[PDB]
Design a protein around this ligand. Structure first.
Ligand code: A1A2Q
Length: 288
């Protein structure tokens, strides 16, 4: 087969002439991710190189790249373009110079206004994914990019994780909502849950359940959910309220993305340029 319908996403041309100074940045289960420079625009991009030959049956399934093509939003890392050489698909996406939310969380302390900005930006992205029936599933520190000009973007989701029951857990899935860990049918609002968790992490410098064995963490998530703050009184009442609405254990009561964009806590937001000192400090701390 000719893999039809590649026509819909591939542009003509050699991606090794359109882009230069490739540098490897991420191996990965089916994907090398490079960084590189557009020879015409100067712009830096991420390029995922995919061997369709080793793409087990996942052929039209992996033209959910076409879904990436249709669904574009300021608060996600967007598809830019794609090229083909032989059976190597190069997918070109936005590159954001900055750091991950994790790095900033580990090396700086954030105030409530800056946390309010991040959450605002994350909720805009969520609202978008949700209106288009995408659940992200992995809303963690590690999948938020903070841009040196104040951009916030979500990263590392599909749709268009499942571990055999017979397997040990090694990692703790600290971000996962209750209804997820007990393997019930779930919806969008799990992303809200996880955002909740992520907000705690921005305050505490760390995720919940890091002192915890994975199976205990699972249990606590199912029975208690709302991880329960080291020192509540440290947080403004409005922020705790925000947390509460995100971390409501009954799905129906927990807030939607759209609801929560109207919550009073996002009115604290500082402008996004307030995130840029956070990044510079994180870069400085990591020169080790
Ligand atoms: N899934 C997480 C997000 C990617 C991250 C890679 N490191 C990094 N560090 C500084 C800036 C930056 N910007 C990016 N823009 C686009 C990008 C790609 F599309 F590759 F994800 S990474 N990325 C580590 C784990």
């Amino acid at each position: 087969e000719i893999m039809e319908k590649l026509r819909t996403i591939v542009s003509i041309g050699d991606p090794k002439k359109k882009y230069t100074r490739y540098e490897k940045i991420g191996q990965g289960a089916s994907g090398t991710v490079f960084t590189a420079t557009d020879v015409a625009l100067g712009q830096e991009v991420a390029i995922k190189q995919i061997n369709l030959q080793k793409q087990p049956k996942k052929e039209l399934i992996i033209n959910e790249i076409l879904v990436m093509k249709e669904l574009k939003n300021p608060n996600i890392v967007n598809f830019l373009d794609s090229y083909l050489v032989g059976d190597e698909l190069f997918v070109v996406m936005e590159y954001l110079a900055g750091g991950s939310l994790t790095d900033v969380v580990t090396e700086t302390c954030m105030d409530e206004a800056q946390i309010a900005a991040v959450c605002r930006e994350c909720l805009q992205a969520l609202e978008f994914l949700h209106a288009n029936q995408v659940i992200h599933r992995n809303i963690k520190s590690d999948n938020v990019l903070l841009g040196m000009e104040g951009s916030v973007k979500l990263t590392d989701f599909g749709f268009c994780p499942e571990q055999s029951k017979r397997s040990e857990m090694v990692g703790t899935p600290y971000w996962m909502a209750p209804e997820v860990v007990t393997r019930k049918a779930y919806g969008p609002k799990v992303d809200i849950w996880s955002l909740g968790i992520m907000a705690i992490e921005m305050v505490e410098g760390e995720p919940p359940y890091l002192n915890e064995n994975p199976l205990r963490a699972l249990y606590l998530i199912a029975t208690n959910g709302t991880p329960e703050l080291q020192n509540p009184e440290k947080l403004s009442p409005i922020f705790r309220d925000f947390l509460n609405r995100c971390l409501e254990m009954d799905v129906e009561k927990r807030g939607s993305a759209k609801e929560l964009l109207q919550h009073q806590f996002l009115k604290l937001a500082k402008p996004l340029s307030s995130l840029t000192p956070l990044i510079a400090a994180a870069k400085e701390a990591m020169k080790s």
